[PDB]
Design a protein around this nucleic acid. Structure first.
Ligand code: XG4
Ligand code: MG
Ligand code: MG
Ligand code: MN
Ligand code: MN
Length: 540
DNA sequence: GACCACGGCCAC
DNA sequence: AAACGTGGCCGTGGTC
C-alpha cells in the first residue's frame, strides 16, 4: 500500500514503534518507523533514528517520549489517536480495540503501527469535528498533559532502599509469630494465603458463622469485613487479620519496590496511564504509586521511604474535600456552597459525630475514615452496610443518611436530573463535557440498572475533579521548569513535587496558588500543602 | 515460562 | 458482604 521510503521521514510524520515490554523506562526499542504522504519510512537502527524526530505523533506517543527522555533526548509527544478515541468514549482504552473500532489492526510491526496511527488519526479527527468541547479537552488538557506525564515518568522518585531492606527482615519475623499462632489455633498447618483453605478452617473445622458470600463463585467469604464481624467469635480471627495486614504490605510494597530501582537514574519510575478509566482519572501502574499505604503504622513507615534527592525537598499539595466542593458547584446547593464559603470541614464534622469527640480531638486517621462515610453515603451506601461499618443500629444509620441529604436538598435533585439526561442521551458528562456512556441506565433488571445509576452520577463529580487536576498540572508544569523544580507524582487530587531546598517555599506557594485558581467555581478550592524530606512528612 | 479468573485489599 | 464510586497488585487455583 504505502511506498517504502528511506529514513528519515519528513517533519510531522506519524510514528510507529515496538517495545520489548510495555514499560518505556525498561523497554528495548526493537523497531521504529514513520508514515506520511503515502510513504512509510523504516529506521535501520531505531535508537540512532530517534534523534531525527522532533515530535512523537501517533499511537502511544507518550511512551515513546518517555523512552526518548531516558536516552537523553527531547522528544515531546504530540497528537495521539488514543487520546481522541478516549475522549469520544472512555471505554476506548487499548490500541487493539481502538484500531478495530476506527479502521485498522494493531500488529507487532513498527511500519504497520505508523501507517495505522496515520489512518486512525484521520478518522478520529473526522469523528470529533463539531465536538468543540471534546476538542477543547484534547487541545487544552489531554494533548499537553501527555508531555507533562512523560517528564514525570522519566524523572521518577527516590526511594530509601536500605531502609526498606531492613524493614522486610523485621516484618518477616512478625509474620512468622502470627502464622505460627494461626496454625496452633487451627490445630494443623495449611496455606494461610489460600482463602479456599482458610474458608474450610474457619467455617467447617471451627464452625464459625459465615455471614457473607463471594460474588462470582458463591463461596463463604473470608474478607476483612466478614472477619471484623467475628473478631470476638474466636482468637484466630484477630491473628488472621494481622497476618493479612503485614503480608499485604510486605508482598506489595516492601519487597517489590526496592527491586525496581532503575540502574541509570537510581530512581523508581511509574507509568501514568492516560486512557485507562471511565471517569477521566489517570491511573498508575508498574508499579502503582497511587496506592502507597498511609493508614496503619507500618503503612506510614513505607511512605517514609519515598524521599527527596539530597539537597532537595518534597512538596505535597492536596485539594481539600475536593469532590464535595465539585458537588457544590454542579448541584448549586446553597447549603453546601455556604459550608465552603464559611470554611467548614464536613469530614471533621462527620468524624466528631462518629467518634463522639470535639473537632479538635479528631486526628487524620479518624478524619480519613469519616471521609469514607461521607462519600459512601453520597454515592449510595445502604443503611445496612453503614450500620455495620459504624457499629451502630440499622435505625441510626438510616437516620444519618436521611439527615445527610436533608442538609443539602439540591443534591438529590441534581442526582435525579443527571440520571434523566443520562437516560435520554446515553451518557453523562463532566463540567467540561467529558463523557461516559452508561447504557445500563435503561436496564430492566433493577440491581443492574441501580448499579449503573451509581456509576453514572458519580462520574460527573469524580470526572470534574479529574479535569481540574489535569488542567492544573498543565498550567503548573511550565512554572516549575522555570524555577528548577520537578513534578514527580499525581495521586488524583494531589501532586508531589521536588524542589531545591532554597526554592521549596517559593515553589510551594506558587503551586498552591496555581492549583486553587485553576478554574474558579461557585466555591473556593483550597489546597493543603506541606514540605518535607519524605512523603509522609510532606503531608503533615 | 505464560495466560486468566477470582477473592481480597491498598489508595484516591 | 452489604445499593458507595474509580483504579491496580497480590497469591491461589486452574490451565496451556
Ligand atoms: N466514592 C469515593 N470516592 C472517594 C473515596 N475516597 C476518596 N474518594 C474521592 C473523593 C475525594 O474528594 C477524592 C480525593 O480524596 P482525598 O484527598 O483522600 N479526600 P478529600 O479530598 O475529600 O479530603 P481532604 O483532602 O480534605 O482530606 O477522591 C471513597 O471512599 N469513595
Ligand atoms: Mg516491627
Ligand atoms: Mg478484580
Ligand atoms: Mn483531597
Ligand atoms: Mn488526596
Amino acid at each position: 500500500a504505502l511506498e517504502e521510503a528511506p529514513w528519515p521521514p519528513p517533519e510531522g510524520a506519524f510514528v510507529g514503534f515496538v517495545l520489548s515490554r510495555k514499560e518505556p523506562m525498561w523497554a528495548d526499542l526493537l523497531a521504529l518507523a514513520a508514515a506520511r504522504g503515502g510513504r512509510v519510512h523504516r529506521a535501520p537502527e531505531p535508537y540512532k533514528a530517534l534523534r531525527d524526530l522532533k515530535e512523537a505523533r501517533g499511537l502511544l506517543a507518550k511512551d515513546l517520549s518517555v523512552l526518548a527522555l531516558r536516552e537523553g533526548l527531547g522528544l515531546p509527544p504530540g497528537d495521539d489517536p488514543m487520546l481522541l478515541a478516549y475522549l469520544l468514549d472512555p471505554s476506548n482504552t487499548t490500541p487493539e480495540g481502538v484500531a478495530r473500532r476506527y479502521g485498522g489492526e494493531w500488529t507487532e510491526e513498527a511500519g504497520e503501527r505508523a501507517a495505522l496511527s496515520e489512518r486512525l488519526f484521520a478518522n478520529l479527527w473526522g469523528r470529533l469535528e463539531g465536538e468543540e468541547r471534546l476538542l477543547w479537552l484534547y487541545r487544552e488538557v489531554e494533548r499537553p498533559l501527555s508531555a507533562v506525564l512523560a517528564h514525570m515518568e522519566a524523572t521518577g522518585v527516590r526511594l530509601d532502599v536500605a531502609y526498606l531492606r531492613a524493614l522486610s527482615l523485621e516484618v518477616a519475623e512478625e509474620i512468622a509469630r502470627l502464622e505460627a499462632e494461626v496454625f496452633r489455633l487451627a490445630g494443623h498447618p495449611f496455606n494461610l494465603n489460600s482463602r479456599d483453605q482458610l474458608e474450610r478452617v474457619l467455617f467447617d473445622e471451627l464452625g464459625l458463622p459465615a455471614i457473607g458470600k463471594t460474588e462470582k463463585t458463591g463461596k463463604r467469604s473470608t474478607s476483612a469485613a466478614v472477619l471484623e464481624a467475628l473478631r470476638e467469635a474466636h482468637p484466630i480471627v484477630e491473628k488472621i487479620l494481622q497476618y493479612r495486614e503485614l503480608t499485604k504490605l510486605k508482598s506489595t510494597y516492601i519487597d517489590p519496590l526496592p527491586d525496581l530501582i532503575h540502574p541509570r537514574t537510581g530512581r523508581l519510575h511509574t507509568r501514568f496511564n492516560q486512557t485507562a478509566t471511565a471517569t477521566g482519572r489517570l491511573s498508575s501502574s508498574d508499579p502503582n504509586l497511587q496506592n502507597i499505604p498511609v493508614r496503619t503504622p507500618l503503612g506510614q513507615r513505607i511512605r517514609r521511604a519515598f524521599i527527596a534527592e539530597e539537597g532537595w525537598l518534597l512538596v505535597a499539595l492536596d485539594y481539600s474535600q475536593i469532590e464535595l466542593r465539585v458537588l457544590a458547584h454542579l448541584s448549586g446547593d446553597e447549603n453546601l456552597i455556604r459550608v465552603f464559603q464559611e470554611g467548614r470541614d464536613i469530614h471533621t464534622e462527620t468524624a466528631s459525630w462518629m467518634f463522639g469527640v470535639p473537632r479538635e480531638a479528631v486526628d487524620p486517621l479518624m478524619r480519613r475514615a469519616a471521609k469514607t462515610i461521607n462519600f459512601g453515603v453520597l454515592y449510595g451506601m445502604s443503611a445496612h452496610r453503614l450500620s455495620q461499618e459504624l457499629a451502630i443500629p440499622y435505625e441510626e444509620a438510616q437516620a444519618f443518611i436521611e439527615r445527610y441529604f436533608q442538609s443539602f436538598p439540591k443534591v438529590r435533585a441534581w442526582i435525579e436530573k443527571t440520571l434523566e439526561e443520562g437516560r435520554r442521551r446515553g451518557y453523562v458528562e463532566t463540567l467540561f463535557g467529558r463523557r461516559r456512556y452508561v447504557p445500563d441506565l435503561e436496564a430492566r433488571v433493577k440491581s443492574v440498572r441501580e448499579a449503573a445509576e451509581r456509576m453514572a452520577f458519580n462520574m460527573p463529580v469524580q470526572g470534574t475533579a479529574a479535569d481540574l487536576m489535569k488542567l492544573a498540572m498543565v498550567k503548573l508544569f511550565p512554572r516549575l521548569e522555570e524555577m528548577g523544580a520537578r513534578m514527580l507524582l499525581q495521586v488524583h487530587d494531589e501532586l508531589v513535587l521536588e524542589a531545591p531546598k532554597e526554592r521549596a517555599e517559593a515553589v510551594a506557594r506558587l503551586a498552591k496558588e496555581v492549583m486553587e485558581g485553576v478554574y474558579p467555581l461557585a466555591v473556593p478550592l483550597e489546597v493543603e500543602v506541606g514540605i518535607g524530606e519524605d512523603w509522609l512528612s510532606a503531608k503533615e
